[model samples]
Target: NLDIIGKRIEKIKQEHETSWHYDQDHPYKTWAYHGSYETKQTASSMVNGVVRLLTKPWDIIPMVTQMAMTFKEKVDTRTQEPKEGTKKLMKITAEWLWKELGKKKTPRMCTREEFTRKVRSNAALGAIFNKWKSAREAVEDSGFWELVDKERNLHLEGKCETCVYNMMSRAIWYMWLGARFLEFEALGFLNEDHWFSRENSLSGVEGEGLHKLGYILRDVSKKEGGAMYADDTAGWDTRITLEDLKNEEMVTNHMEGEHKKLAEAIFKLTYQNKVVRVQRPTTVMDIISRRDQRGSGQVVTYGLNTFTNMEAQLIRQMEGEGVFKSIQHLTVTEEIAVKNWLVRVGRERLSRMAISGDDCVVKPLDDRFASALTALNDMGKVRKDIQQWEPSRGWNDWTQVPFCSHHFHELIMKDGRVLVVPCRNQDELIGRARISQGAGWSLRETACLGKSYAQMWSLMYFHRRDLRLAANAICSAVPSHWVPTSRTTATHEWMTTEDMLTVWNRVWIQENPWMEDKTPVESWEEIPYLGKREDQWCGSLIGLTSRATWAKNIQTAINQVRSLIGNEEYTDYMPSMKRFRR
Candidate 1:
């Protein structure tokens, strides 16, 4: 028994195991910084460290302290009623966290003087271990895992413990399908010409606005500004909120009684016929730079159809350094700003601490978390040079696109033109906005955030190299995407077990070998859900080699693909994978 474990450890040590070691390069997937992955050596060391804690009691100091998050699985499925159509991301109290480790499990008193000083610990040992919390944080960085899903009361990232690769199967392609399937006829057309002036009478709102504003709406609910259309030609007509237009010099400025009615009548095209204000965002960022103010403290989502053009110009040029998107007049709360800011600070501090070998028998550099909070007040500037675009580019004036329905009131928006849709409010907003964001600003933000997050994860996890590596069995479990990636295909045609591992995810399988099922019909036809079964995860997976034979170079080949990853996922997202058949 001892020899088996010892040989495994030595084998792990012998391999070229340097990966996202939790001390350098801010290495996260797409730079999202949610968590990090641990290489086998570091994990092996940790296992040994724990063993040393139990075996070598005197030298180990018995008491260890560093930030720690203790987990207790919470579930009552045995006696509870499940919600209809509710997915498995619910049920378990997957995570309820805290920033401070001392609060959860107090450290133990090491020396007589330290006991007099009242230190905390679980083992009753005085001095705690160093960089362990840093190591722990490095283990949980994928964005797909952290954020909690509000409704099901569970993790949005699902349970990916055994294989993070399963996420690529389900999550990535789902996003692509969302962008690909939105309706085209719904986005109205634009007429760009001079209608009245001694020029072409056929002129309408020029297609120019389409390049800037994009024909996407906020997709509000029916109770709000639901999804309804006006005459066939109303592409750039935007719907703005009362608060948005409250101070605009172009609109508003009405008094009570007759004055109120008159202003309402004059801009009746902009307002939904309903009495209350539309809950969804009616206005968007002023891309053409028409007004001094746009919305305050809100993120404006748009449709996927907008991807046709505005995306190119959406990239902004700051004082110089690099490029970023410009959403002028759009507001973001201090909370959101603070979270993004913390991403940089937390990773920085985490990386620094992860590299250090200090045992916390003494006071820390940030005893009061004083150094950590400073990131809130002093985040580095990633600026956007707003209020610089030319104002003469009034979308309507430049394009001169006349409202197709003279009787119906159409809204002239700062960055977008919209129809006062007539559907159920929030539902319409949510349904359409999901598609919109899946393809629009939210998508851009995810891509942008991923770069930074990945860099952070790389730095934070694979920071420095240590030779005492341990093999991580689960890391090499999933099959590569190079082969057929579907369940519908015959398993006989499959290339390797690597390809078979992800087939259980049931995402639209990209055909590979050894599969017995037929190819999936088309793309995005079922919208985001597409052609796949309901829960395709697994309870367990077993693999030992690329292939079996009286072969040599076995360790080298297995080592080539076998990987070690962090502990955050392999257990949380449970198995939905059924037998792989057509």
Candidate 2:
């Protein structure tokens, strides 16, 4: 194991060197993502990368996670905010709350009357600890523990109390009960569409409510509503003055009422029928998704659905609105607009620009994808890439196009209701999914831990040709959720690992669920607990195609999906992936 692990550290370095050869001058202008045809090197390669991954994962996982930790931030100055680092006020709050709780005779004990008094006295207004008492009584009273710790194992199924992994799980005992999850659901999650909007068909489906992070954000209490329940931290409300205490109470109180209304609705149905999905609430959503174009179980990516394009429109719209003279007066819409602006800057072939304060002349988006439109116009290239990588047998469509979003316009259904979604690429999902797996599997030590597949997966995601092709095929895909920009505690679980596994195994792996066929991996355990798959390949810095066969397999896997799904008319009649500019 030591021999293999030692070689891989060097392998990663060698791969990086082989992939990128930087020039001496103006190095800042040349980044892998910001490169043009002339500058774009091959993406990282993935040939037999799975085999290379059978090494110690902990040290490498952090480096990989650290690489993107500050993504979309630090790129453009206008989007940057102060005091929002790895150590922020909210983090301080979580730490403080944890310490205070440790002083308790029994940390997990739940007595709302008693607990609430302690939290309130600890810092009147309950600042951060208020949500704990709310969730604690709810969990113990309702047997909510069954949903979270279904495996029983006390959620310590594979315990190593000595480690930080479990250290956080102890804190988790105070978090994410059905009542809280139920509460956040009613308040809304996504920014564009929340459940209450007439813009959607769902009667109670709130698209823009509270959502999941690795750890859930507990920013509001029950009984609050009317005014928004924006969290005190998260920079939603830029002011934190003691003078603002009265204002803060009103804000939190408004959200509390909203939370309880939704919670009670869900709770009544949940407790009464002694079931969840069987309720009118779930039925309520089912009816709406069928009517709303965006609410479907899946939405295809074919046609003109594009996030960057919509972002361009949003930028110009913000640009049209006079620039903010004072950062203090800038509204939340301006914040999202400014943040999206940086994303536009980051996408440039040569991301050269200046942050002259509010007057920055950001680079304009071009029609480089015009060629892609032509490339994807015909199924010929799509067919070719599939033949290039498909396993000896075949491919599955869902695996190829896991999900969709905000980069799109509203799709009006036949009844005239609107639907909104984002356009995230498979690459983002690939990295996110891998991270979820590592945590979900509760993996601590395995000499052959397969976390390294991410590099290889990223290569496929970023490969201009390969990714665009997937984008073309991905036209036929669908997806949701909302959490704050940052999470409550350091140990937030983005989504359950099982959630990713559902897509990974049941959806992405099989040829299609409609037809009964074997998937690449079946059952949760079949997913390699240790060691990477034999055919996995990897790349870095440059998109290395060192292992040509491995690249071929990935392309084949993706293309095979397009070919198989092509037989289905719903996905076949779509615009070229490159056709949409916004």
Candidate 3:
């Protein structure tokens, strides 16, 4: 029988008939390593190998890395949120300094190099430096170094650290670097007559002192001992518990009083305001039409106004043909008449469903008959006639049948009228036309056509080669007369569908015969290009192309013109060219 199985088999045969075969070579799988090197030595060796392969020893890679590390360390110290240990250490160092020099005299200003030299010269300072060095060595030796490296790699891979300490450290380091540069400028270390000098007034001892203090602050904050300075009560044991430290008010007050001030000052000094104001003459029209003038003189303003008029002569012509009456057997309204006019003009444009049901009256299906038929078919029981098909009938009164839902059958009655009758079992209806015929076949074909058309068009439009050809055609066809003077040097130009439609309509109409649309050849008598000029011709063309009624006419004209041009040539190359209409 021509049931679902038979249909499926037929479909398979059709696919096989149309299918193309091609042998595909197996793709080579590319492999990649994901894990880190087992040791720093291994990583270093790999890095060296890469450097040797791709670069020389004199290349910027190593220098850039060293510079980056130095900058990072300096930034970390300046910006790092002082931990308890760091703060304690800083306080101890400060106390020691205070003891050594006393409150009366400030410490001597020295360069970082000179300061290190002094530290080495003094036994006590040297011991402190050694202590600091030893602590740093200890941190490096600990598993923390490996963790840091792993964490950095993880960060590179998109895992962002949400730790408050990390954020604060970054902020502080950047601020410290800025402060150092400002100090350098202020001290006149770079240049006394530089632009910075005019902006930054700090100079002499005052500038040097400020610079030194900034450096000390940054260094201490980053140092292991300087960590405690981040909070005032870092080393102190107060009656207030650690819970008190977590209080919102305590944190807010500390941040507001200290961190915020430092952050603001650093940011402000780094990026100074350099806004400049320029004055220009106001338009005469604007000045004349002031807010105070409630009852003003009549102002005649010029504007590009558009008006569209649709004739619908074709629609009136269609109505006279009586096509609507013959098809639908009804008198259509003006709107429906207009739509039907479009249908007559372009039959293929109308939906297939609309075309198919054009003769059918637009009414709801009769429910009572449908329900009765459904009940009989679904229940597998039917009554003989109207008299026997009563609701009060018992089970014995009903006629039982082996109704098949899958198979559809068409039968000819005694009067030679066709009736659709479903088979009791679709599988039993083998080799029967009743199982595979009628309007349903047309519907399936239409659906497949629609799907195939959409897929084909999508590929055709989106294909790179097709797109390039389209682009080239468009570029070559762009009217030199319409080209703007400002766009003389431009490598590319674009126009909207509406613009193209306008041009096409103007060319088709043949209105302005004498005037060339291009810019004037003479400098004295400069006629603006078609695109630049805003006159009646441009205005009317724009309206015809954009407005709804005239838009349809313009589109139809374009399609007709396109057909005449043929598939291989540009639209502009079409015959029967005319001048733009006035």
Candidate 4:
């Protein structure tokens, strides 16, 4: 009747048990807010209080209101896309400058301070200075005006119209900033010296003339205005039509751009209503600072290299800050490198998706995805027998031999019994890993793995006070020396089912084995995920202590490791699609 009684009691207990008491994953991951909750309440209260004052005649004192106003003229003058005809012409001219100036050897540029001083008066130049503090060659300025002057001639000859100067200015700005930042080889180099002394150089243009040029070009598009000396017929229309006026309001108010929609979608999808300090994406700065010299070689060959002495100075400063290769003591060294591999794979996947026109859709069984998954599956099979430990061998003999795969930090418990904890860079150390594997900035997979590890650790510490922790089940499952970790040999080997249960049960139940007192069951009930009553608590503990449960933990850890080793970027990038695609 004990079993019958237990079943009857369990059925009775279920009657009162609520779904809210059951542990489950949080439903909402992303959230948005206009203001803090308290601030919102305060504003509402103040508005309610002000209503009484408004009810009284004459609004008591003046009603307080803050509003932003825009003039119709200002709205009308906002930048617009050039006409198709104008756009084609502008493209031809812009490409001409890219070839003519960007390809040539740039002369020695003015110093940062000199360029700042020269361009200080003009707001356009002022904006440039603020955007990038780097030195600019005088040839860039001279080369720019060369095209501007040619455009003027073209306008005079009636070869082209639609005032292409603004487009040319945009191209130059892009060449100076965009091409330089996005890809180094895109821009041409400065090869020769004494070029600074050459006639018709940057300094030859009167500073006021350059300032005026920037002023005219600012806030205008290629087809939106006329040439300084051209006739009005082929130029932009000064008057707005009725149709254009009707559409203006729609165009201004409607959220229409594809890129803007994508941007908003990305923010909404990724934002979790919490402060997340995303790691900065790599740029030309990383390429320049790299010691391997592969990137530097390209820079030198392209004649785009500068700050030779500055490079040396920067290298020294970086070394001083421990920014260089200092991950010898850390466990995530190879893991960080693996992130780079993931980045390269990610970029390739994205490039392929873009080319295939399937980036917008989700296809789980796609061939490209299969390739990455196969790569991971191959790595996921951990070789448990490679350095298997025998129970008869004892800890002393195992400690002397470096047969285990992972690094272990010997944590001596209060009982003086040695508990070996697997070393993790994020868990053992504070802050993020300084180095990560991956070629470029789009390392969503790599970043998420680190976050997952941190989250797992948080769960571990919350569950267990001593060496008996939840994450230990995962980390301790590393099979052999074949695994990619900081250590070739470890003091301890992978924990078997018996070993894991021994440790888990020692802390959970066996330490104080008095069943009537129910001390361990009470403690288990206190764990939110376990249960409230004795039967419920015992059921959860039984499940947790199962060999199958431990194996599942091992498989999950190994799978995660494999994902890191291979490429999980594409899958990580589209989490929502991956979840529901089936």
Candidate 5:
């Protein structure tokens, strides 16, 4: 056993060395889920489109001035009598309106009488004036006017796409354009030629354009610092506040009332048809458990569904065995109160019987075993010292040590009593329970004795050989609960050892189901516990693959196994061997 421990220590060192080398080649990076590329591309185009439209409000200012002047001049040129003063004043008025709108101030329409009269008089000039007027209104309506540099009287650089979207989203009609269109249609804003009035447009399902756009933007915003972006649908269409959420408590209160009604209905149904004497309240869980067992002999079995009922049943069984009379002062005042007390006593007694003193015999700890345990405890110290041995030392120069902290060993004495060595110091072992095993069974001398027995059984089945040993271990693990009897007493006969072992092993293998033999185990056959198969592997250690055949970089299979086990890697998709050991 010490030799095996030594071998494991060396194996762990090799694994650590391999891991260090691997890490040198492959460094770590931050892992986060940004929006998908398709979403990003779509959002980019949408942002660019909005940016271009926003820039038009500012860009069209100079163009509108020139076009309005040109239209006024062209109208005069075609008429024969040229009104030069009207054309000149029109340019001035347009410029004035642009400046006033950009500053978010009210322009005096009363002062621009001459310009308005000329624009209304000529049909072509009026058309041009409308275009110029609409562009200026859009700037004001979209709140782009406030973002302009008042000192420079110009649109600032680098404030086009990101800045406008971030700032103007707070107060903008265009931001609510998609959602408002849906609202308009709902409120009869559709005309005879409107797209919503077209054939089959509103006939079938609806297109949630605003909702989709909001979701896409939400994903994009999460990728681009969420706190800075106004991405939620509530804020986009119609802004909602914390007060709105606070005022919605009425709905939750109504839901709570409905839940209470349902809970009372279930409780009433569970208790209404009971003929037997009620030991406790029939809970909601009891009713739910009987949902699938509709046609069974009884809809609700007493001890089958709940731990409370199980404890109650144990008390009744113990009373039937006439085991409560000896305690003179401990009268049964309340059955429910005394239930837990009785069960605890029975649990302690049965667990002790399972771990009988006759099953194990203690012996003095051996010198070699003590030294091995010491080596295990000081494994970290040894590894650290090697690293500090020489500053210039490479991976090849350092001595490797085992990674495990605990130690376990089994020994057979000359008189045929088996020793169960613990991970304690020799001094502690002198006066304490040094574990020992009998012919076919094993026992733990301390803490959670039943649990320890189950753990040993599991370890034997998963990590060691000899099914007989594993079977016997399970027999000693069983408590009084699983044993078939109408009454509970200390002197009740247990099932035969062979029968218990056979039943346990069969159930374990059957429940786990076997793995297919097709999985290759070529080089891994060297590992005794893992490689061997008793009619195909069952339980946690199921899949046995030969890593040497398909391992990357042509690495040795033994090293790969060592690395995998040392790292303690397991996925939820497969049953893990880790649960069996402890």
Candidate 6:
């Protein structure tokens, strides 16, 4: 068993190393939802289309991405550089490819048509195109082309249609002119339709020719709306404190009565019988006693007593009419009380049984009580059979309730009565108890015995001496109450309080439910009575020890089996069995 356990530990360590390496090789990163494009031109162009669809140009619109990939591709091509500017153009294209397609290589395709579409889609390019067209038309109307040919001793470049050099120079000039428009647009000097304004147009350029000239000579201009490039120092000290105050006041005026409206609705839901609901009350005395404010603020404690009184009145009325007879046992402490109350009621009042240890105290035949008995019946008579019963399903389904806490006992009286006791000692048990009571659970451990079984046993001892003292202390601390009874003794024939407490302190031993399948080191530490000689002696001398070292040896073997099954790399792969064992 020791040899196998050593091999299993080695296997687990190797598996962890392999998993760590795989995770390191694939690190994760995040990118902006929009605007992660290669060039500023392409990014601006996409923004322009978004502005056109959602709002007017230059409107301080809320930022949101709305364009598809096909639209973005079209815009990128048009604003790209011409053949002469190939070097600059290639850099932009490469960057775009890297960012958008995760391709670091040079671009595959480039053409004039593609360039035109790219510019048209880009907001900045569109602005520049409009500006260039307007400038060229103005120059032509002034006869500047003819003057340039005659004065520079140059021949006429065979009319405008066939003039290649002339057209090229004009294109360059328009591109520069568009750059100026961008400067003015950044300063908020240019309006959305500044170029097309009547005041900006040239004289004698009218009708279809003028219109055609306007279209042909139009250059793209950067206007206020396209991608705003503000001066770095603008609006550094602007303040809107007054505006914020006004907005807050407006919100408060409209929403101040919401709490009252909610309270009325909840009242109707609870008391009008429209919905089945649980009520929680807060008392004035409780509030007053707990009213010390720790933080830097004034605390106003009010209306708690009035509200509590009203709730009590409502509950009393409801109970008198039998509107809600079944109270939910909300805490482990509360559940214990409810169980005790039910047992006492059935034996003393219903069955007319005397308060004596010899009297037979049978369990009640109520629906809930009967279901609990049925579950215990399915656990069978043998200890192994009870241990092997299905926890989640089948006839032994008390585990499904969660309040049963996976540790419960069923006591059968000689008179055929049965009693159920659910243990609560850990966080999970407390959580189950809270949930069963319809109360949301908190991580805080409110009850002291919730710490451990030893603490729990101590509490049971305290309660055995005087149940009322324990009950009253719990009721005072938590949201609960206890009904008074005239009975002086319990009906069950269990050991006396002194005898029970003594046995609990001296003989009870803690053991892991899975002790038979744990490693030696883990089992020795976790299973209290089996670890040390003093504890072991106590168990053995008291005749409470269940098995010798043989059982523990078997458990060590089982732990190795579990480790191999769980560790993936321990199978017939990677390093061979001998290598892994080493």
Error of 4 at 384 (Å): 80
TM-score-wise, the better of 4 and 5 is 5
Show where candidate 6 strays beyond 4 Å: 1-404, 412-418, 424-453, 458-582
Q: What would the per-residue lDDT of candidate 1 be over residues 155-207, giving only the tens digit for each residue?
A: 11211111011011001101111111110001111111111111111111222
Q: For candidate 4, what is the lDDT?
A: 0.23
lDDT scores for all predictions? 0.18, 0.23, 0.21, 0.23, 0.21, 0.21
Supply candidate 2's per-residue lDDT for 367: 23
Per residue, candidate 6 scores C-alpha lDDT tens digits across 61-110 of 12212221122121111111122222222222223212321122211212
Model 2, range 231-337, lDDT digits (tens) per residue? 01111111112111211112122234434343233222221111110012111100000000110000111000111112222222233233222222445565554
Q: Which has the better lDDT: candidate 1, or candidate 6?
A: 6
lDDT of 5 by residue, 1-582 (tens): 222122323333343443311122211121111111110110011111111111122223343223222121111111111133222222222232223222322211111233234223321211111222532243334243232222112111101111100001122112111111111122111111121210122110112121122222222222311011000111111111112112211111222333323222222222211111001121100000111111101101111111111222222223334434322233444333344444345333111110010010001111121112111111111122223232212111101100011123333333333222222221221111112222222222121232233333332322333222222222222332232211101111122222333433333222212212222222212212423352132222123232112212122322332242244321110112222223
Candidate with maximal TM-score: 2
Under the 3 Å rule for N, CA and C atoms, how many clashes does model 3 have?
Answer: 20
Which ranges in model 2 have alpha carbons more than 4 Å from their true place?
Answer: 1-430, 437-544, 553-582
Which scores greater on lDDT, model 1 or model 3?
A: 3
Give the TM-scores of the predictions, in the order they appear: 0.14, 0.24, 0.11, 0.14, 0.15, 0.14
Candidate 1, RMSD to the unseen true structure? 30.6
Worst 10 residues of 5 by lDDT: 353-362
lDDT of 4 at 304: 17
- Could you tell me how far off, in angstroms, the CA of residue 107 lies in candidate 4 after the best superposition? 6.5
